[PDB]
Amino acid sequence: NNYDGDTVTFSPTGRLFQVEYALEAIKQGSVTVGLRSNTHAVLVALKRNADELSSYQKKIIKCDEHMGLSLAGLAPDARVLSNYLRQQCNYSSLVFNRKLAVERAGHLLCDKAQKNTQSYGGRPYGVGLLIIGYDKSGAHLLEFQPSGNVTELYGTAIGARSQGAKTYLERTLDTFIKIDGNPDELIKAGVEAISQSLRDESLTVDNLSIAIVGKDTPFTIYDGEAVAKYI
Amino acid sequence: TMLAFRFQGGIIVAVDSRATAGNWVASQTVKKVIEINPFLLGTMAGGAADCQFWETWLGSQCRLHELREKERISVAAASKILSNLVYQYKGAGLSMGTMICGYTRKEGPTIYYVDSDGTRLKGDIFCVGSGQTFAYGVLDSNYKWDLSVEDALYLGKRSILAAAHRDAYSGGSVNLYHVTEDGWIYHGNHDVGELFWKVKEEEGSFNNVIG
Amino acid sequence: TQQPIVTGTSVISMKYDNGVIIAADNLGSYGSLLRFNGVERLIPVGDNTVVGISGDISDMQHIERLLKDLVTENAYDNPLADAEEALEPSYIFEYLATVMYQRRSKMNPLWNAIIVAGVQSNGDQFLRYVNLLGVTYSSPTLATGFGAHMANPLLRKVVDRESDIPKTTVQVAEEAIVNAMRVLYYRDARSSRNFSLAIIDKNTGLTFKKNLQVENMKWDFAKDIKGYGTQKI
Amino acid sequence: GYDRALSIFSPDGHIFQVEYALEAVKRGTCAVGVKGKNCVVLGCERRSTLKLQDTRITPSKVSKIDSHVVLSFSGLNADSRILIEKARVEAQSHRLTLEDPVTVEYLTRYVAGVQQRYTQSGGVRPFGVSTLIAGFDPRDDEPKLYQTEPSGIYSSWSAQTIGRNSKTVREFLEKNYDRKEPPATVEECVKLTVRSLLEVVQTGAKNIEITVVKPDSDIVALSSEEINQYVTQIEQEKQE
Amino acid sequence: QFNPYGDNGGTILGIAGEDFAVLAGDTRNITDYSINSRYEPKVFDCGDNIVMSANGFAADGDALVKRFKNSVKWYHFDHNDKKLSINSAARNIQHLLYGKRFFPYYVHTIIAGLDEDGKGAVYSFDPVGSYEREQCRAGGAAASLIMPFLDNQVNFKNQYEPGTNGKVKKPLKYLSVEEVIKLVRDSFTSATERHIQVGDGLEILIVTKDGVRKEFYELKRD
Amino acid sequence: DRGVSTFSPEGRLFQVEYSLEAIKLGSTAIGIATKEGVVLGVEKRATSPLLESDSIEKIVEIDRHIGCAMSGLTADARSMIEHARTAAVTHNLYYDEDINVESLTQSVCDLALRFGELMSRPFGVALLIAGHDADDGYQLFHAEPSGTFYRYNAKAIGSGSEGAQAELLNEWHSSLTLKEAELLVLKILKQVMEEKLDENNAQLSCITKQDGFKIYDNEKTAELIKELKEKEAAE
Amino acid sequence: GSRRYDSRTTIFSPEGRLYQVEYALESISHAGTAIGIMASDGIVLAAERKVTSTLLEQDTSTEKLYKLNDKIAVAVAGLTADAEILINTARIHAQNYLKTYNEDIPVEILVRRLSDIKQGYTQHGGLRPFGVSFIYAGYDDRYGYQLYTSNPSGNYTGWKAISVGANTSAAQTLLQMDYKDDMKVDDAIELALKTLSKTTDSSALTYDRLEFATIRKGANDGEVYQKIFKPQEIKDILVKTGIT
Amino acid sequence: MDIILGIRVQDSVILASSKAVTRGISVLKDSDDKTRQLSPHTLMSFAGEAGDTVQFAEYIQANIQLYSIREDYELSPQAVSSFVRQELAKSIRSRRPYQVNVLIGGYDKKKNKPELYQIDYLGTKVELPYGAHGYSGFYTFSLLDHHYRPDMTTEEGLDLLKLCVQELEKRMPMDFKGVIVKIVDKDGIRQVDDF
Amino acid sequence: XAYX
Amino acid sequence: XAYX
Amino acid sequence: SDPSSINGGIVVAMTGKDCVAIACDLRLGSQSLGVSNKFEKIFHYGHVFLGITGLATDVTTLNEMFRYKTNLYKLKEERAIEPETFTQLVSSSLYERRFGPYFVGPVVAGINSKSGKPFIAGFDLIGCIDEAKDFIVSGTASDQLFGMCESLYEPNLEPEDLFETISQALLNAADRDALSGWGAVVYIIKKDEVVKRYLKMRQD
Ligand SMILES: [Mg+2]
Ligand SMILES: [Mg+2]
Ligand SMILES: [Mg+2]
Ligand SMILES: [Mg+2]
Secondary structure, three states: OOOOOOOOOOOOOOOOHHHHHHHHHHHHOOOEEEEEOOOEEEEEEEOOEOOOOEOEOOOEEEEEOOEEEEEEEOHHHHHHHHHHHHHHHHHHHHHHOOOOOHHHHHHHHHHHHHHOOOOOOOOOOOEEEEEEEEEOOEEEEEEEOOOOOEEEOOEEEEOOOHHHHHHHHHHHHHHHOOOOOOHHHHHHHHHHHHHHHOOOOOOOOOOEEEEEEEOOEEEEEEOHHHHHHHO | OEEEEEEOOEEEEEEOOOEEEOOEEEEOOOOOEEEEEOOEEEEOEEOHHHHHHHHHHHHHHHHHHHHHHOOOOOHHHHHHHHHHHHHHOOOOOOOEEEEEEEEEOOOEEEEEEEEOOOOEEEOOEEEEOOOHHHHHHHHHHHOOOOOOHHHHHHHHHHHHHHHHHHOOOOOOEEEEEEEEOOEEEEEEEEEHHHHHHHHHHHHOOOOOOOO | OOOOOEEEOOEEEEEOOOEEEEEEEOOEEEOOEEEEOOOOOEEEOOOOEEEEEEEEHHHHHHHHHHHHHHHHHHHOOOOOOOOOOOOOHHHHHHHHHHHHHHHHHOOOOOOEEEEEEEEOOOOOEEEEEEEOOOOEEOOOEEEOOHHHHHHHHHHOOOOOOHHHOOOOOHHHHHHHHHHHHHHHHHHOOOOOOEEEEEEEEOOOEEEEEEEEEOOOOOOHHHHHOOOOOOOOO | OOOOOOOOOOOOOOOHHHHHHHHHHHHOOOEEEEEOOOOEEEEEEOOOOOOOEOOOOOOOOOEEOOOOEEEEEEEOHHHHHHHHHHHHHHHHHHHHHHOOOOOHHHHHHHHHHHHHHOOOOOOEOOOOEEEEEEEOOOOOOOOEEEEEOOOOOEEEEOEEEEOOOHHHHHHHHHHHOOOOOOOOOHHHHHHHHHHHHHOOOOOOOOOEEEEEEEOOOEEEEOOHHHHHHHHHHHHHHHOO | OOOOOOOOOOEEEEEEOOOOEEEEEEOOEEEOOEEEEOOOOOOEEOOOOOEEEEEEOHHHHHHHHHHHHHHHHHHHHHOOOOOOOHHHHHHHHHHHHHOOOOOOOOEEEEEEEEOOOOOEEEEEEOOOOOEEEEOEEEEEOOHHHHHHHHHHHOOOOOOEOOOOOOOOEOOOOOOOHHHHHHHHHHHHHHHHHHOOOOOOEEEEEEEEOOEEEEEEEEOOOO | OOOOOOEOOOOOEHHHHHHHHHHHHOOOEEEEEOOOOEEEEEEOOOOOOOEOHHHOOOEEEEEOOEEEEEEEOHHHHHHHHHHHHHHHHHHHHHHOOOOOHHHHHHHHHHHHOOEOOOEOOOOOEEEEEEEEEOOOEEEEEEEOOOOOEEEEOEEEEOOOHHHHHHHHHHHOOOOOOHHHHHHHHHHHHHHHOOOOOOOOOEEEEEEEOOOEEEEOOHHHHHHHHHHHHHHHHOO | OHHHHOOOOOOEOOOOOEHHHHHHHHHHOOOOOEEEEEEOOEEEEEEEOOOOOOOOOOOOOOOOEEEOOOOEEEEEEEOHHHHHHHHHHHHHHHHHHHHHHOOOOOHHHHHHHHHHHHHHHHHEOOOOOOOEEEEEEEEEOOOEEEEEEEOOOOOEEEEOEEEEOOOHHHHHHHHHHHOOOOOOHHHHHHHHHHHHHHHOOOOOOOHHHEEEEEEEOOOOOOOOEEEEOOHHHHHHHHHHOOOO | OOOEEEEEOOOOEEEEEEOOEEEOOEEEEOOOOOEEEEEOOEEEEEEEOOOHHHHHHHHHHHHHHHHHHHHOOOOOHHHHHHHHHHHHHHHOOOOOOOOEEEEEEEEEOOOOEEEEEEEOOOOOEEEOOEEEEHHHHHHHHHHHHHHOOOOOOHHHHHHHHHHHHHHHHHHOOOOOOOEEEEEEEOOEEEEEOOO | XOOO | XOOO | OOHHHOOOOEEEEEEEOOEEEEEEEOOEEEOOEEEEOOOOOEEEEOOEEEEEEEOHHHHHHHHHHHHHHHHHHHHHHOOOOOHHHHHHHHHHHHHOOOOOOOOEEEEEEEEOOOOOOEEEEEEOOOOOEEEOOOEEEEEOOHHHHHHHHHHHOOOOOOHHHHHHHHHHHHHHHHOOOOOOOOOEEEEEEEOOEEEEEEEOOOOO
16 A cells, blocks of 8 residues: 555565565466376466467476476566576586586576565566476476566466466376376376366367476477377 | 778779788688678777677777667768777787778768877778788789779788788688778689789789799 | 795506596695695595695695585585585585686686596596696596696506596506606605505495505615716726 | 766656656757758757857857767756767777777767666656767768667668657648658758758757758858858748 | 696597598597596587587686576477578587687687588687688697598598699599598607506497497507 | 656556547548558648648558558657668667568667656657558558557558548448559548648558658649549549 | 655755755855956955954955956955865866966956856756855956856856845845946946945944955056955945945 | 877977888878868877777767867867866776877967977876877987977977988888878967878 | 688 | 985 | 986075075976076975976976865965975975875975074975974985085075175085076075076077
C-alpha cells in the first residue's frame, strides 16, 4: 500500500511487496513442468503465442552441455539470468576444467537475485526458472524464485494453473522417480503432468516444448515435428 | 610492390602477390587489393595483418556511412577515416602503406596515399613497397595522360613485373584492376613465372637475363 | 618483472600401473648459499593430489595459501566435498595453469615450475607440468630444472611410452625415483641429501614420506684420483 | 551525479516534460521559414515591450551554424545557445573528417538527435526549444528548410512557422503558399514571409527580423529601412 | 629481465583435397635441447568440422585454441545453433589474434575443414591475424623444410609436361586422401631427419562431410 | 512520485505498460511475410499540408537483407536503428557473413529494458523488423519496448492495429505472392487511415533474397494503388 | 530511497515555465534596485544598498558593484554569496581568454559564458539555480560601450539603459521617458540618481545607501578608466545634481 | 616537408613553401601545398614530422573557423598566433608532442598592417620582418639581412623571395621541387601560379 | 609477423 | 639546481 | 638538447641607493642560428619587474601565467602585489612543476611601495629562492655576470652611476658568451619613476 514503492522498503508485517509483485508476474506466465528420475531430468513447457499469426514464445534455454532451464514470467529477465549461468558454467570449465554442479548453479542465481531486493534503484527479477542438469551426483531439478529462494525437487511446475501438474507429480512421485534408462517414458510422464494444467486448449505440434538431460544425453531441446511422438 | 595511376580512361591499380618473413618467402598467392565497394579499392603494403585488418574495418565504416547518409562515401572521406585511425596509433608500431583508389560523381577518379605515420596525399601516380623505385622507373618513363585503357593496363602490369624481377621481396603474380565512372573491373591474375618469358619474347626486353 | 631469491631445485615424478610417484629435496637455496634445510616443496591437496613446486619459495608459499584457500572454498555449500564433488587433480592443475598464464600475461610471473601428480575419481593417473610462462605438458615422466636433464633419461628407461605404465610396479617406480634423487645429489650444486617422496595409489591412496636421505653412495673410487694429469703422488 | 528520470511516461502514454517543453515553445516569439525557387527566408518576431534595447549587441534571433546553414528558434533563449554551440562544433567536426560541409538534413538530424537524447537521459529536462534550420547543401541550388522540436522528431517543410500565434500564420501560409509555384524571386519570398508575420506581429517597425539565405554561402540580414519598405508596400495594397 | 615468450618447437601441416582436408602436426614438445613430452597433441577438433593448430609458444597456442573453442560455443548460443562456416571461423580468429596486436600470440595458426560448397579448405594466420586461404601450408620450426616440397608435389610448381620444351605446365588436379597422407608422412619423416625439434610421433586429423577421423604414426625419437 | 522500474500489483512494469499506450497513438505500420519476400508499409500522417511528406522516414534500412518499419515516438527509434546497423555491420566484420534476422532483433531488444535509476525511460516506439537469411528464410519480427519480440506471418502496429490485425487474420495464407501482399498492405492501410490513401501519405517497401531491402518510389506505389482500386471494383 | 525528498529543481510546469527560475526572479524583485545607463562617451552603474544600518562600515564595503577586469564591471541584484561564486568564475574566464589570445575578452563572450553556466543549473544537476541578476557594464574595441543583463534562466540581452531588482517596472518607465541616444556620461549620472531617488522604498536617497561607478574614456587618449565611487565622491555628486 | 619561408613587406606578407614530399629514396609528390587558410586574412605554412604537420594545421584551422562562426568576427593575426603558440606550448609536455614548425602570415584589418609570426614546435613565438624554419634560415636570413628593406612593395618582396629560392636551389643538398608562393594583404589570400 |  |  | 642553452640569453639585477636596476640581452636563437634581436626577457606586473632566462617557450608561458595570477591577485586584494609576495608566488608556481619543471632562471626586481626598500631575488628552475642585498645573475653567461658583478659592484650607488655599473656588467659578460648579446635593455627603477634604456653593443 504505502510500502510497495520500492524493494528497499519492508511492510509493517515484514513483507517485501515489490518481490511479491515480481512473484505475481510468474503466475501470469505460461505453465512449465520439471521432473527427474535417477538417470534423466526432463523439462516440459507449454509455449504461448500472441495470436494465430504469431510464433510461440520459446520457454527453454540451454546453459551448458549438462545443464539448462525453462522460464515463466518476464522472458528478458530469464535471458539475463540464463546468460549469467552460461558464464558461471563456462568459468568453471575454463579455470577448473570442471562441470559446474547444479547445486552451485542454484546458489549463484539465489545470490544474484538477492542483491536486487536489498538495494535502492534496482528491481527484483520478474521470472521463475526450472533448472535441470546431470553432474557428478546424478540427475537434478531446481526451482528458482526471484525472491532468491532456490529449492531442489524430484518434480515441480510453475506458471498459470501449475497446481494441477504439481498435484499429479505429488501422486506419481513413486512411479516416475524409478523410470531409469528410459527417456521416452520419463517425457510421457512429464507430458501427462503438464496436461493437468490445460483448460480449453490441448497440446499441439508447435505448442509443446520438451527438453532432456541425462547420463549419456547432452541437454537437447525438442520442438516442432520432433514432439509429435508425445501427443 | 603496388602502384596506382590516374589517366584519360580512369584509374589503373596493379600489385604483386609475394609475402616475406625476412628472407623466407611465406606466400606467392597473397591478395594485396581489397574491394571495399563496387567504386572503392584499397591496396595493402607493410604489416600483412595491420593492412588486412584495418582496411576490412575501413570497409565496415564505409558501409555504415552509406546506411546513415544514403549516399556512397567520397574517396576523400574514406581515406581520411583510415588516416585519422592510424594517426591515433602513431608511435605504437603499426606498419601501413596504403593507396585508396575510387570514382565518385563529385570527385571523379581519385587516388589517396595513406601511411602509418599519418601522411595523407592526393595524387595522380603512386608507387609503394620495397620495389616502389623499380615500378616508378618503368611507370614514369612510359607514363602519358593520353594512354589507352589497353596500354595503361599493360604499363601497370609491366611496372610490377619490373619490380618483381629486381626487388627480391617482390614477385609471385600481378593482380590488375581498372576503375571507371561505372566502378572497378578486375583484369585477372598474371603469374610472373609465365608473364616474364611472355613479355621478354614479345617485347624484346630483359636482355640482362640468360634467354 | 621479478628475479627469484630463495629457490627450490628439481622436482621429479613418473606414472606406474596403479598411480603416480613425485619427489623433491628439502632445500631452500639463497644463490650459492644452502640457506634453509627444513623446506617442504611437496604440498598435498586432499587425499588424491600432490603439487611439487620448484623455483622461488616466496612464490611457492603464495601458491600453498591459494591451494589451502581452494580446499576451503570448495567445501562451502558442498555436502559432497569429501565425495563426488571433492577436488580432482585435473581441477587443481587447470586452476594453477590459469593463474600462471595470467601472471606471465601481466609481466609479473610466479617464478616457479610446478608438477601436479594425483589420481582422478575414475582411477586414471594424473601427471602434468606448468611453469612461470604458463607452458603446460604431460608425459609418463616429468621433471623440473636439473631433473629434466638427468632424472627424465633414467625414468624413461623404466617407462619410455604409454604401454610401459601397466608393466611398471610401485616397487620398480619408487626405486627409479630414489636412484634419480641420488644422481641429482652427485651432480646438482643446489641439491641436498634430505628429500620428501609422495605416492598417490588408486588402491592404497596417498602415502607421504618425509626425512628420506640419499644412501648407498659411491665415493670410494675418489681415493685413487691424483692431480689433473701428470701428478703421480 | 544527479540521476532522476525527469522525462517519464504517464498512464495515458504521454511524456509530460516533453509536452510542457512544447508549451515553452508556444510562449516563445513567433519564427517563420519560407523557401522560394532559389532561396530560403527566415522571419522572426521581436516583442516590443522592451524599449531602451541595444540592437547592435543584443543576441540576433537567427544564428549562422556554418557559412551555408542558419538556425532560428522559438522557446527558451538560454536553451537555444546550447543547441547552436553543439551544432556549430558538429559543423566544423564534419568538415574536418568528411572534408565537406554538412548537408542541412544532416545538421538538422544531429540537432534533433541532441534534443531526443535529453528526453530519455537521467538528471536532465528536455530543451524548451523548436528550431527552423535552413540553407543549401554544398554545390547544390535546391533550397532546404527543416523543423525540429523538443521530442526529437524533425521533418522538411515548403514553409513552416513556430512560436506564439504560429497556428494563425500557419493558417495564412497554408492558403497563400502554392506547392506547384513557390516564390520565384527573393523579393516575392521575403514579401510572403513579412505578410505572414504582419498577421500576428503588431507594428512593422523594429519588431520583424528578416534573414535571406541564397546558394553558395550567400547569407545577409535585412536592415530596418529595407524591411520597412516591404511593410509600407503591403499596407498600401491591402487598402482595396 | 623476465622474458614472457618461449619456443616449444614442433611443426604443423595443412593440405586441402576436393571433398576433404587434413591438418597434421608432430606430437613432440621441447624447450631448448630438452624433450618435455613425446606425445603432447597440438591439433584439436574445435567442433563444426573445424580442426585448428596454433604452433610456436604452446602457452599462447593453448590460450588461443581455448578462446576459439569458446568462441564456437557462444556462436551457437547467440545465433540459434548455426554452424560456424570455415570462412567465418577464420575472420573470428583474425580478431582474436589482432586483439593482442601490441602483445601478440607467438603462434603460426592453421585451421582446416570444408567450405560451404563442401570443398576442402585450409586457412593460415600470422601471429597478428593476417590470414589467407590456400591448398597447402606448413607452419612451425620445420615449415622452411616442408613448404617447398609441398609446392612441388601438391601445386606441381617447377614441373613441366615432358617433351613440351618447358612450354606446357603440369596440370593442377586434386589429390586422393591416400596420396595426401603419403605426402604428409614423407614430409614429417624428412623434417624429423634434419630438424632436432621435430620427431617422436605424427598425429593427422582428416576432415570429411562424415566428420573428423584421426591417424597416428611413430616418428624417430632422437 | 515512484520508482521507474516499479512493478504493478498485477505483475507488470508501469513504465513499459505506459509506453505501449504511446505506441497506440502512433501512425499505422503493417508487415506481411511471404515465400517470395516480406512487405513493409506505413502511414506517413503529415501534421500539416506544408510539410514535405517525402522527408517522413518511417521505413529504414538496417542492412541489405534487413529492413525496419516503426510506430510511436519515432524520435526514440533513431538510437535503436543506429544500434541495429552497428550490430549488423559489426557481426559481418567479426564473422564475414550476414547476421540472422532473429539475432539482429534480439540485439535491439536487449536495449529495451536497459532503463532505470542506462537511459531514464523505456522506448516509446515499436519496430517491425523484416529480413531474409539462408537458415530461416523470409522473417517478420515485432520488437516492443518490453524487450519481447514475436515472429509474425503478418502484423499491424499503431492506432489502427487491432482493426488491421483482425483483417490480416482472414486475408493471410501460406501461398501469398509478393504482388498479392503489396496490394493487401495498401488495402488494409486505406481502411484504417484517417485521410484518403495516396502515394504521398503512404509508403511501401519490401526485402527479397535477390534484390535485398528496397523502399518503393512514389511512382511505383501509385501504380499499385491504381491496380488495387480497379481489382476491388472488378467484383 | 532519497527520491522522496527530491524537489526536482530542473523540471517544466504544465504551462512550460521553470518553477525554480520563476521563484528565483521573485527573490531578485525584493533586492536593492541596480541601474545601468550607456552613454556615447561612457557607462554609469548605480545601485541602492539594502536597508543600511548606521554602524555599517560604508567605505570598506562591496555589496552591489564588482570589478571583473580593467574594462568590465557588474552590478548585482539577489544573493551576494551566489553572485561572488559567479564573479570569481567570470574573473578567471577573462584571464583564461587573455592568456590564450593575448587580448582582453570581448564583453559579450564573458556575458555568454556566465549566462551558459546559469543555463546549466536549470537543465541538469538537480541543484537550485543562482538567485542573481547581473548588469554587465564594459568596453571592447569591437562594439565599444555595452550594457547587458543576465538572470537565473541564463538568458542575456543588450540594453541602452536597464534596471534589475526592486521596482524595475517603475524604474524602466522613467528611463524610457528621459533617455536619448546623444546623451553624455554626466547626463547619464544625473538620470541614474534621479530614477533611484523616485523608485526608492526609502524616505530620502543619501550617500551611505548608494554604490556608484562609471566606465569612461576619460583617461588620457584612447584608453578606458573604471571609477568605483568613494563615499565622499557619492556625497559630492548627490549635492551637485541637487538631490540633497 | 622542409623549406618554409616568410617575408613581411610594406602592405603584405608573402609565404613560400616547398612542393616536395619525400619518403625514403622516393619523391612521392612534387605539387604539395604545405599551408592552410585559418581565416580570410590569416595563412599558416607548416613543416616537420610526417602526419603531425597536416593533423595539427587542420586542427588549428577547424578551431579558428569555429571561432569565426561563433562571434561572426575574424580573430587578429596576433590573437591567432597566440592561440597556436599555446596549443604547441601544451603539446611539448604531452605524452606524444606535435613535432610541427609553423609561420603565420596575416593582414590585421584594424591596424592596416601585415604581420609575420614564426612559431617552432616548442611554442617559441617571434614577430619578424622575415622568417624561416629548418636549414632554410642558415642561407636566407643573412641574404635578407643584406637585401631586405622595410618599405618594399609586394613585387619587390617577390624578387627578394626569388633571390632566396635561387640560393637554396644552388646550395641545398635536397631537391625540394620549387615552392608555392602565397600573398596575404588587405584583399585577403591569393596564390602566385607562375614561380 | 609477415610483411611488396 | 642549487644545492653544505 | 640542453633546454637551458638552446635559445640562450641573460638577465642581471642590482640594488642602489633607494633604487633597483634589472637588465637583459635581446637575443633569441636556435643553438648557433640567431633568429630574433627583439626578444625582451624582462616583464612587469604593476611596479614588480620579472626577468626570465632559459627556454623561450617557458619564458613566454611563465610571463602569461604570472600576468594571469597578478591580475586575479589585484582584483581580490584590491592592491598591486609587492616584490616579496610576488617572489613567494614565483617559488610556489615553479615547485608545483617539481618533476616536470619550466627550464627557466627567473629574477624578481622592484621597490616595496610601503617600506620603500629596494628588493631583488633569483630562483633556480625548481623554485629555490636566492635573496641578495647586492645583485642576482641568470642565463648562459651567469659565470661571466658573477665575475663582472662581484668586481664592479659597490653598495649605495646613485641611479645614474648604478646604470653604468649594471650596463658594463651585462655587455662585457654577453661578449664572452656565444648565445648572449644581439642588443640589451636596462630598467632603472626609482620609487615612482622607471627609465628604460636600450644599449648599443656589438652585434656578433
Ligand atoms: Mg620486406
Ligand atoms: Mg635426441
Ligand atoms: Mg656574443
Ligand atoms: Mg655571432
